Design a protein around this ligand. Sequence first.
Ligand SMILES: CC(=O)N[C@H]1[C@@H](Oc2ccc([N+](=O)[O-])cc2)O[C@H](CO)[C@H](O)[C@@H]1O[C@@H]1O[C@H](CO)[C@H](O)[C@H](O)[C@H]1O
Ligand SMILES: CC(=O)N[C@H]1[C@@H](Oc2ccc([N+](=O)[O-])cc2)O[C@H](CO)[C@H](O)[C@@H]1O[C@@H]1O[C@H](CO)[C@H](O)[C@H](O)[C@H]1O
Lengths: 159, 159
Amino acid sequence: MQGVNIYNISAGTSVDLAAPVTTGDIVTFFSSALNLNAGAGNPNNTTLNLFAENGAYLLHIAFRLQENVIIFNSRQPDGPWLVEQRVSDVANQFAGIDGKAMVTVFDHGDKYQVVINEKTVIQYTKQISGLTSSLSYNATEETSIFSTVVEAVTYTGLA
Amino acid sequence: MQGVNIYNISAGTSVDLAAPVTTGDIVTFFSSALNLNAGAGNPNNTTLNLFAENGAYLLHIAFRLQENVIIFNSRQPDGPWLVEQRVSDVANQFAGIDGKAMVTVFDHGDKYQVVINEKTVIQYTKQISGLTSSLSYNATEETSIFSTVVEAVTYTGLA
Ligand SMILES: CC(=O)N[C@H]1[C@@H](Oc2ccc([N+](=O)[O-])cc2)O[C@H](CO)[C@H](O)[C@@H]1O[C@@H]1O[C@H](CO)[C@H](O)[C@H](O)[C@H]1O
Ligand SMILES: CC(=O)N[C@H]1[C@@H](Oc2ccc([N+](=O)[O-])cc2)O[C@H](CO)[C@H](O)[C@@H]1O[C@@H]1O[C@H](CO)[C@H](O)[C@H](O)[C@H]1O
């Protein structure tokens, strides 16, 4: 059965999905703000994460203004960060829409397709496989590029 | 190639899709407001529509607060309106989210699954088949239950 689930994620918190995200599923994060003037992160300004049930970072999306890049990586719950994939020119990815943004992740089985607004920024070859059972939005109340609360909407049971 | 498209639909207007919505695709209408104290409709307070290339209403979603029902119907290019399907208790369908709302439509080929926020309100067996090439949001300032502008996000090329 296809379903839609909605979550309010406050900066620095995580949520367990009522409906896990697997191959064929979609998750979109909505921000009611776009603060490209957030300044230096620590080192990240904002991160959006998809976690496996074992706590592994299946997909880690990090916006780092001080380096003008968007980083994509994975990490076992007990291992070190793996190989980073980077997309340069942050402002460029959000161009066209001001004061807000949306980041969509399509779980394609072997890859995660990440779209910022209407622009696909990367076809991320997975470094770790599995279903996503938790999501998180991490940032400080001072240096995040997104609103204090980010809304996550999942479309599951699609396949 | 899976894609995300965003449209800003002002009340009383329609938009042509850059990427048509077909079987397996999804469209979600986002309202930045939810006025359940709107004046009586005549008879509709708000309607959301998916049109075929020929102008047929593939799916017509009409909210009627005063009558306390949501109407689902289809209309042939030159009319007439077809068989209406109704769902009672409008307020209850939006229960869970205050001051805003989302209506999602899944095109399952033989049916359209409509979900208000997280609740599926109907599995509408199509009366008219075909590709969705445009969308519309109709309402006026005093009768609408939604915001002046409704944002529509389409997820296509999913199948
Ligand atoms: C502070 C900082 O920019 N950290 C970067 C940096 O980390 C290292 C680690 C070790 C050494 N070294 O022994 O010489 C140099 C730099 O580069 C890393 C990539 O090579 C990371 O970018 C790291 O930041 C961390 O990135 C991960 C995701 O990959 C995650 O975002 C962490 O929160 C972040 O600290
Ligand atoms: C005004 C109104 O309530 N229109 C309804 C109604 O149509 C009639 C027809 C005759 C009379 N009357 O002689 O007193 C009153 C109401 O019921 C129709 C269904 O039997 C429709 O629901 C009609 O509204 C129209 O519905 C279609 C979708 O089916 C669409 O929403 C039109 O915009 C709407 O006017």
